[PDB]
Amino acid sequence: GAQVSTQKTGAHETSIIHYTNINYYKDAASNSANRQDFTQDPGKFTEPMKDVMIKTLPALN
Amino acid sequence: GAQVSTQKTGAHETSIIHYTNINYYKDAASNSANRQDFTQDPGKFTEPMKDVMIKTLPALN
Amino acid sequence: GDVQNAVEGAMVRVADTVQTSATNSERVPNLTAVETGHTSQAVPGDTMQTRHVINNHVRSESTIENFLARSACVFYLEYKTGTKEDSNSFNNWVITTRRVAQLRRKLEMFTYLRFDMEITVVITSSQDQSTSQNQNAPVLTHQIMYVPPGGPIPVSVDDYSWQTSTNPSIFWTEGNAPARMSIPFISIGNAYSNFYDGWSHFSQAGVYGFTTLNNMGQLFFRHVNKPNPAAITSVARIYFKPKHVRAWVPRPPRLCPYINSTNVNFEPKPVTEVRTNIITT
Amino acid sequence: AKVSSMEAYRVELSTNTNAGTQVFGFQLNPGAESVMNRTLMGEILNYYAHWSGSIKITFVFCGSAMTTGKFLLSYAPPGAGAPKTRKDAMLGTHVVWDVGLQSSCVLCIPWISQTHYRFVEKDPYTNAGFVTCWYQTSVVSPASNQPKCYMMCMVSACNDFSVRMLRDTKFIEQTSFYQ
Amino acid sequence: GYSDRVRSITLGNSTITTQECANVVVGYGEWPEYLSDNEATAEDQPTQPDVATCRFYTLDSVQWENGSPGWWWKFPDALRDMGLFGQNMYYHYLGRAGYTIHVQCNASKFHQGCILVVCVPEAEMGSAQTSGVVNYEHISKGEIASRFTTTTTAEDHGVQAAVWNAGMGVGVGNLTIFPHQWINLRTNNSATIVMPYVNSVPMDNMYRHHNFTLMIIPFVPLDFSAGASTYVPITVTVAPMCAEYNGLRLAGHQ
Amino acid sequence: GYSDRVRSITLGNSTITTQECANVVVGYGEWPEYLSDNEATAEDQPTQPDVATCRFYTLDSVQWENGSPGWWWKFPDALRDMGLFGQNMYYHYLGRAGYTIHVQCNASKFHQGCILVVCVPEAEMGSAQTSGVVNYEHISKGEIASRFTTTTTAEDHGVQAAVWNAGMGVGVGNLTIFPHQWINLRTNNSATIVMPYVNSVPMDNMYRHHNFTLMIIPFVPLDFSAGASTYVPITVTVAPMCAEYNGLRLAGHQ
Ligand SMILES: CCCCCCCCCCCCCCCC(=O)O
Ligand SMILES: *C(=O)CCCCCCCCCCCCC
Ligand SMILES: *C(=O)CCCCCCCCCCCCC
């Protein structure tokens, strides 16, 4: 029941290394920190607009 | 997700032994030393020549 | 190849001796011109008649990794068991390669260096002499804290800084195995620079040399234990191992003795050792 | 006095101000220079030791609707020193903002650096140059209009921005525990 | 046809000829080229002046004498006054370029002597007064040759230029690890080293950083006999290659 | 979307905005472009500095006053000190370029006044003293506005700048035949003229020849009333386009 995942390596000069995970305990709280999710959505803070603001257009018209 | 590789043994009288690797951590920095890459290219230091110098020929002509 | 993927090598043996016969010809493998900037790629078979030898020798230990990846001491630091009042109750080190002579000469054989690092630290304690040296002192825990360039310095053995809400720290009890960490390639530039023939200021001034580039932050050390009646002194030895190494631009090794950990200064030494006569046995 | 007040946020502009006049100037050390230092971007920066990316300073005119003006918004990269004159500023990366119905103009500051990353802390090697503002023409107004008015400046990080080497901030401390 | 002793190099409105060369050294095997979109960091468009910048600049030539210990020049700084290269370097925070270095020295079948011609990357020099620090005016006279010393001492914040330690605490006989040639007066009248941009970062400031130093050191002293032409100079001409500049503002120093 | 009153022009590390423009005049219908292989004569490779030269240079702005007669600037000479354009113009015998001229002038609904903004090719001006000859210092102050005179007389070898004859023996009301716009304070706050290289020969010397003159002449005087902002400047910012240079040598004047 082992999980294989990808290690944080770095941009190589013009790669994929893996690591292994086995969860030892019966409680998900006991698991490692969720450090590899680089997901984001600034939209809700940077643009909470009802009417979509198109950059090349004037903001007011 | 285990990796099998070759151990440094030695020239035998006229062989292949293996070792196992499992990366335990989420960061490639945490990995063992890259000790088995015996690659080389003295050319850049021993011969930085624009015109290729052929050994059996005179250096200057 | 991927210097971080350790278990992935390349076996490259040394060159074999090919058998040479006698010759009488116009080709001259050992007559050349040093002026060119080229090194002669001659093999003994161009000058002698050689036999056939199979060289199964490999250039193993001379790999940059096998050469640099042996854990060396870079510095040691000292601190006593004490109160806020005692300045000596804690200590710090600004991180630098140039403090010791041995690893510094090894790294400096290359201009530019890119690697990950394994830091091991041997913290050792001793009883101070005192009327109270008789004392039941319990097991001492230690704190090593990394403060990256910009964070709060600890002013005392006992201030908010030691909380480490964001700085990396290691807590280590005595008697256990030496504390060990791995460090990524921490630099802002594409490779670490052992040398910088340049200035800290655009106007050709301020700080000259490598110092300007190598801003690594610092390690703060303290005891976590409250003081026992008699003082106990601890000294921490910081060990560095360059692993996952890449190296650029080879240099001549340091001939002259090192003087300053700050700069590349030297006083002129002889090129080699002197001998009895130009004809020696 | 003005830093513990709302004045801190409003830059004072005036009518009949002569053409090449400088509005303000400072070197771009986000997270280190008092002007940007404790803003949202500045505060985030202060939990890190390395930054990277482009910054955008959005200039908003809060003068009378009946008022007018043109300004040179400049960014000089390092090495030469701070732009002493509107001509010096002109030579560097710049926007000439004409104020009008669109209230605000944004000066987009490009990441121009030797290195992929700079320090958050002020460092001579990781110097980022100077952002300055100048009257390109002047602020002009009609008859019963106020002579002095104000502009204001917003700042944020563009989609190429990032931060590294996590650290504790100098911005908060204690002597003892709280109760 | 084509004797390999003869060479013609043309770059911009410049041609150098030589009829006694000993091949040409391409630094570390790499020919100079422009900064690529993968390796870039400064987001602004680079200015690439091509022929206006990338051409042959002859720097102030020095005289070789029997007892003269040696010379060094620092790049790009030696070129800080050379035409439009200098101007571009003056108006831009960042600059990048490789270089064709051509050292010239002619004498006669009857003269003798041999000089090392070498391009040392990051040649960070030591202060003569080990206690103190060095300073720019004793590190570089721009296009004018800074001399190596036979004497083990110098004026306040002067570099320790004692030749056998190459101004940097090492054996001068090992300088050969860097891209180099030799002008041995028997063999050749010129040296040519094509140096790539060697540095730890894609672009850098043209003033602050001396990316490499050109050292010309006489290993075998200049000699000749009874009335056979005393004056024999060494002239260094250098051409920037693939030069590009980022971050433009006013005239720059501070 | 898109009100035609709003415009954004970007060239090099330069953007000018305007929220009250009146279209943009492309000189004689032609957008600037580089000298082609058919029309060329100087055989050497041109240097084309692109973004380093071709960017927005703001020249010394002048004040518009009720009785102020007018102003002129001469190109390329006005740019002889503007950054790397100036340097390239200084180190090359021949130069060629077109230009985006952007005149700026803002005031208020309550102000009134109207200026002609015009690019006159070969505006060869007459000597005030008809008997004598004119001279450079009375023809051009580089980036500083040379003023037109209401007065019919001037100091030794000064141009006859009497406004109604435009400094060149013609009716100023006919200047409109040349590429022009008007900043009428009611209507707009800026003018933009994109001038092509107009000349009888493919390239020319950047100093000797003033290829065209920018004249800003107030046809309706600046006016406003009782305490409504006195100071109202006129700022000219200009960007070189498709600039290329031939014939490189030393720093040039004589
Ligand atoms: C308890 C956490 C400790 C974290 C320690 C971080 C240490 C950073 C080490 C930087 C090593 C830099 C090597 C520079 C080499 C050189 O250029 O000479
Ligand atoms: C899936 O889990 C089976 C894969 C092989 C498991 C090897 C297990 C390693 C040793 C046991 C860990 C048990 C933790 C309770
Ligand atoms: C691939 O990784 C699965 C192969 C079998 C794995 C045995 C794992 C050994 C015990 C767990 C090591 C876990 C380290 C986090």
Task: Read off the tokens for A61.
Answer: 């018209």
| Residue A18 C-alpha, separation from nearest chain C C-alpha, in angstroms | 9
| Alpha-carbon radius of gyration of chain F | 19
**Can you tell me the distance from the alpha carbon of F207 to that of C232, in angstroms, rounded to the nearest whole number?**
82
Going by alpha carbons, the residue nearest to atom 14 of ligand 2 is A24
Q: How many CA atoms lie within 13 A of D72 on its CB side?
A: 35
Nearest of C86, C36, C264 to residue E123 by alpha carbon: C264
How many CB atoms neighbour CB E62 within 10 A? 19
Do the Cβ atoms of F47 and F88 come closer than 8 Å?
Answer: yes
User: Could you give the CA distance from residue E5 to residue C49 in angstroms, rounded to a whole number?
Assistant: 32
F198: containing domain: 1-254
The finding on whether A25 has its CB within 6 A of some atom of ligand 2 is no
For D74-114, the DSSP string reads: EEE-TTS-S--SHHHHHHSEEEEEE-SSS-EEEEEE----S
- Is C232 within 8 Å of C127 (Cβ atoms)? yes
With DSSP H G I counted as helix, E B as strand and the rest as coil, what are the percentages for chain B, rounded to 5?
A: 10, 20, 70
Q: E residues 100-159 near D, CB within 8 Å?
A: none
How would you class A55 by CB atoms within 10 Å of its CB: exposed for 0-12, middle for 13-18, buried for 19 or more? Answer: exposed
A61/F1 touch (CB, cutoff 8 Å), yes or no: yes
Task: Pick D54's closest partner by Cβ from E43, E250, E254.
Answer: E43
Distance from CA of F22 to the nearest CA of A (A): 17
Q: CA–CA separation, C162 vs C171, rounded Å?
A: 11
Neighbours of C146 (CB within 10 A): 21
CA C43 vs CA C17, C62, C208: distances in Å: 8, 21, 45
Kindly list the residues from chain C whose CB atom is less than 8 angstroms away from the CB atom of residue E127.
263, 265
- To what resolution in angstroms was this structure determined? 3.5
Q: Which DSSP symbol is given to C169?
A: E
Q: Which helix (H) or strand (E) holds D34?
A: helix D34-37
Residues F99, F214: Cα–Cα separation, whole Å: 11
Are there at least 3 beta-carbon pairs closer than 8 Å between F and C?
no
Q: How far apart are CA D157 and CA E195, in angstroms?
A: 39
Angle, vertex CA E49, rays to CA E47 and CA E54, nearest 5: 130
Q: Which of F48, F83, F248 sits opposite E91 (nearest CB)?
A: F83
User: CA-to-CA distance for C31 and E185, rounded, in angstroms?
Assistant: 18
Domains of chain D: 1-179 (2.60.120.20)
To 10 degrees, the CA torsion angle through F127, F130, F132, F133?
A: 30
Q: Which of C194, C24, C30, C49 is nearest to C110 (CA)?
A: C194
Measure CB to CB from residue F52 to each of E83, E248, E250 and give the nearest one: E248
Is residue C181 lining ligand 1, measured as CB closer than 6 Å? yes
Write down the H helix ranges in C74-196: 102-107
Task: Report the run of H or E that residue F69 belongs to, with start and end.
Answer: none
* Cβ contacts of D76 on chain E, cutoff 8 Å: 249-250
**Shortest Cα distance, chain B CAs vs residue C267, angstroms:** 29
Residue C36: burial class (beta carbons within 10 Å; 0-12, 13-18, 19+): buried
Residue C2, SS3 per DSSP: coil
d(CA D46, CA E189) in angstroms, rounded, equals 60
> What is the distance between the alpha carbons of residues A47 and A40, in angstroms, rounded to a whole number?
14
- In sequence order, which residues have a C-beta less than 8 Å from that of residue F37 and are 6 or more positions away? none
Rounded to a whole number of angstroms, the distance from the CA of A3 to the nearest CA of chain B is 8
Taking the C-alpha atoms of D77, D78, D79 and D81 in order, what is their torsion angle to the nearest 10 degrees? Answer: 100
Specify the CATH number for the domain of residue B8: 4.10.80.10
Q: How far apart are CA F71 and CA F235, in angstroms?
A: 11
Q: For ligand 1, say whether the CB of C53 is within 6 Å of any of its atoms.
A: no
> Residue E76: is the preceding peptide bond cis (ω within 30°)?
yes
Distance CA E31, CA F222 (A): 63
- The closest of D159, D157, D163 to D118, measured between CA atoms, is D163
**3-class SS letters over C219-264:** EEEEECCCCCCCCEEEEEEEEEEEEEEEEEEECCCECCCCCCCCCC
> Which residue type, as a one-letter code, is found at position F233?
P
A7:B1 CB<8 A: no
CB atoms within 10 A of CB C14: 11
Task: Give dist(CA B25, CA A6) in Å, integer.
Answer: 10
D127 is written with which tokens? 């110097």
Residue type for position D33: E
Cα-to-centroid distance, C242 and ligand 1 (Å): 10
Residue in D with minimal Cα distance to C159: D175
Burial class of D31 by CB neighbour count within 10 A (0 to 12, 13 to 18, 19+): buried
Contact (Cβ atoms closer than 8 angstroms) between residue C268 and residue C256:
yes
SS (H, E, C) chain A: CCEEEECECCCCCCCCCEEEECCCCCCHHHCCCCCCCCCCCCHHHHCCCCCCCCCCCCCCC
The one-letter amino acid code at F140 reads S
Nearest to C84 by CA among C218, C222, C220: C222
Q: Fill in the DSSP letter of residue B45.
A: H
Most D CBs within 10 Å, among F11, F235, F236, to test the D interface: F235
What share of residues in chain F are helix, strand, coil (percent, to 5)?
10, 35, 50
Q: What type of residue is C159?
A: D
Mutate to test the interface with E, among C264, C269, C273, C274 (most CBs of E within 10 A): C264
Q: Which two tokens stand for residue E41?
A: 């960091």
What is the distance in A from the centroid of ligand 3 to the CA of A3?
Answer: 8
Name the domain count of chain E. 1
The yes-or-no reply on D/B contact (3 CB pairs or more, < 8 Å) is no
Rounded to an integer, what distance in angstroms lies between the CA atom of residue F243 and that of residue F245?
7
Q: How far apart are CA E209 and CA C187, in angstroms?
A: 18
Domains of chain C, earliest start first: 1-281 (2.60.120.20)
C-alpha D78: how far from chain center: 16
Q: SS3 of C177, please?
A: coil
| CA E8/CA E154 separation, integer angstroms | 41
Residue with the nearest Cα to atom 13 of ligand 2? A24
The residue type found at C113 is L
CA dist., res. D8 & res. E108, Å (int): 77
CA distance A17 to C4: 8
Longest dimension (CA), chain B: 61
| Alpha helices, DSSP H, located in chain F | 83-91
By the 8 A CB rule, do C244 and C116 touch?
yes
Rounded-to-integer distance, Cα F202 and Cα F95, Å:
9
Which residues, including other chains, have CB under 8 Å from residue C145's CB and lie 6 or more apart? C154, C161, C162, C164, C167, C168, C169, C219, C220, C221
Secondary structure of chain E in HEC code, one letter for each residue:
CCCCCCEEEECCCCEEEECCCCCCEEHHHCCCCCCCCCCCCCCCCCECCHHHCCCCEECCCEEECCCCCCEEEEECHHHCCCHHHHHHHHHEEEEEEEEEEEEECCCCCCCEEEEEEEEEECCCCCECCCCCCCCHHHCCECCECEECECCCCCCCCCECCEHHHCCCCECHHHHHHCCEEEEECCCCCEEEEEECCCCCCCCECCCCECCEEEEEEEEEEEECCCCCCCCEEEEEEEEEEEEEEEEECCCCCC
Domain count, chain A: 1
Joined tokens for residue E252: 């720059």
In terms of residue numbers, what domain contains B28? Answer: 1-61
What is the amino acid identity at position B15? S
Q: Distances from the Cα of D141 to the Cαs of D96, D146, E119, F65, in angstroms? A: 19, 8, 64, 16
Sign of CA dihedral A23, A27, A32, A37: positive
Query: Which is it for strands C141-147 and C218-223: parallel, antiparallel or unpaired?
Result: antiparallel
Hey, is F21 helix, strand or coil? coil
The closest CB to that of E4, out of B43, B44, B61, belongs to B61
Q: How far apart are CA E194 and CA E10, in angstroms?
A: 13
E strand intervals along B1-61: 3-6, 18-21
Beta bridge partners of F119: F214
Q: Which residues contact F151 (CB under 8 A, 6 or more apart)?
A: F162
The verdict on a CB contact (< 8 Å) between B46 and C5 is no
Expressed in angstroms and rounded, the spacing between residue A20 Cα and the centre of ligand 3 is 5
**E174: phi then psi, degrees, rounded to nearest 5:** -95, 0
For residue D68, the cross-strand partners are D140
Sign of CA dihedral F245, F250, F251, F254: negative
Beta carbons within 8 Å of B19's beta carbon, 6+ residues apart:
B4, B5, B6, B7, C7
- Subunits adjacent to chain E (3 or more Cβ pairs under 8 Å): B, C, D, F
Q: Tell me the torsion sign for CA atoms F10, F16, F20, F25.
A: negative
CATH number, position E157: 2.60.120.20
Supply the DSSP symbol for B11. Answer: P
Residues in C closer than 8 angstroms to D116, CB to CB, are 188-190
Distance CA C177, CA C125 (A): 14
Query: A5 contacts in B (CB within 8 Å)?
Result: 26
Cβ atoms of B43 and B53 within 8 Å: the answer is no
Minimum-distance CB partner of E22 among C35, C209, C210: C35
Experimental method: X-ray
How many Cβ contacts (< 8 angstroms) between chains A and F? 9
Ligand at minimal distance from the CA of C215 is 1
Q: CB-based contacts of A28: which residues, under 8 Å, 6+ apart?
A: none
Antiparallel, parallel or unpaired: β D55-61 and D104-109: antiparallel
